[PDB]
Design a binder for this molecule. Structure first.
Ligand code: IHP
Ligand code: CL
Ligand code: F
Ligand code: F
Ligand code: F
Ligand code: F
Ligand code: F
Ligand code: F
Ligand code: F
Ligand code: F
Ligand code: F
Ligand code: F
Ligand code: MG
Ligand code: MG
Ligand code: MG
Ligand code: MG
Length: 132
């Protein structure tokens, strides 16, 4: 795990959209609580570029690849002490049997943006804000 100078854990994530119209986004199930949804993402490795970490974590957690788009922003979770670079990713490859599917049975699902914001709100309000 890696950290900013203030001790916040460094993370990266993508908003994995179905298309360039950015109407449908891919969430993945929580590892702790499989009945809940999150935005896929995770820790940056040492010296790892945030865009590289984002794409790698989406591949591991969600089993997708695509065309990397713009940095949306950098988002803090004060409560959990982490700070997340969030990028747009336009999905072009949907893989079966990806890392977390095989290892922890992680699920994924497409959501209209409105619905994504809805299911994120309760446990992951900072993640809901990614879409603002
Ligand atoms: O507190 P939790 O509900 O168990 O959330 C955990 C935890 O997030 P926190 O940093 O807030 O504790 C993990 O972070 P660490 O404990 O490893 O620092 C995070 O891991 P990543 O930052 O690497 O994403 C993991 O997410 P996941 O295991 O899917 O990678 C996520 O669990 P959820 O899947 O329920 O959000
Ligand atoms: Cl879309
Ligand atoms: F995650
Ligand atoms: F992660
Ligand atoms: F991670
Ligand atoms: F991870
Ligand atoms: F990681
Ligand atoms: F990791
Ligand atoms: F990882
Ligand atoms: F991962
Ligand atoms: F993970
Ligand atoms: F969060
Ligand atoms: Mg991960
Ligand atoms: Mg992780
Ligand atoms: Mg993660
Ligand atoms: Mg990781």
């Amino acid at each position: 795990r890696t950290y900013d100078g203030d001790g916040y854990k460094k993370r990266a994530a993508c908003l994995c959209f179905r298309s360039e119209s950015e109407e449908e986004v891919l969430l993945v199930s929580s590892s702790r609580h499989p009945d809940r949804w999150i935005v896929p993402g995770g820790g940056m490795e040492p010296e790892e570029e945030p865009s590289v970490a984002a794409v790698r974590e989406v591949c591991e957690e969600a089993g997708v690849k695509g065309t990397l788009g713009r940095l949306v922003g950098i988002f803090e979770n004060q409560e959990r002490k982490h700070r997340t670079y969030v990028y747009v990713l336009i999905v072009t490859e949907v893989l079966e049997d990806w890392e977390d599917s095989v290892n922890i049975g992680r699920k994924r699902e497409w959501f209209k943006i409105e619905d994504a914001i809805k299911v994120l709100q309760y446990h992951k309000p900072v993640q809901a804000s990614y879409f603002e």
